A = this chain, B = another copy of it.
């Protein structure tokens, strides 16, 4: 279990060391922490979300040695990189007007990873 830390604006790519298949990476104690426009702090455990991204390649034919967070925006780590229900989901931040109020909010992602 090696630790990792990413800050707002980082490109987050989890890569195996020997460029073996990323489907073998597992995660532990992963916390995503962000602020809302009012300045309050929020965090959420995203360990299973990450583990499911790795398991996503479990039955692939050309499995890669990496995966990268970001969605259709290929955007770097930001306050919406993971969902905390009731806080930063689609129903709470539903428009571009609202989402713009969030553009300077902080975001961080820490945790442990290993190959199994």
A interface, CB within 8 angstroms of B: 42-49, 51-53, 56, 58-59, 64, 66-75, 78-80, 82-87, 89-100, 102-103
Residues on the B chain within 8 Å of A67, using CB: 95-97
Question: What's the least CB distance linking A88 to chain B, in Å?
Answer: 9
Given contacts A48-B87, A71-B90, A72-B103, 12 further A-B contacts (CB under 8 A): A42-B45, A44-B85, A52-B92, A53-B95, A67-B95, A68-B95, A71-B80, A71-B93, A71-B96, A72-B75, A74-B99, A74-B100
Question: What's the least CB distance linking A93 to chain B, in Å?
Answer: 7
Contact call A52/B100, Cβ cutoff below 8 A: no
Contact call A90/B97, Cβ cutoff below 8 A: no
Contact call A79/B83, Cβ cutoff below 8 A: no
Cα-based distance from A70 to B94 in the complex (angstroms): 7
Contact call B56/A59, Cβ cutoff below 8 A: no
Cα-based distance from A83 to B48 in the complex (angstroms): 13
Q: Can you identify 25 A-B contacts, CB atoms within 8 angstroms?
A: A43-B45, A48-B84, A49-B85, A49-B86, A49-B94, A51-B86, A52-B86, A53-B94, A56-B98, A58-B59, A67-B97, A68-B96, A69-B95, A70-B95, A70-B97, A71-B73, A71-B99, A72-B75, A72-B80, A72-B93, A72-B103, A73-B73, A83-B90, A85-B85, A86-B91
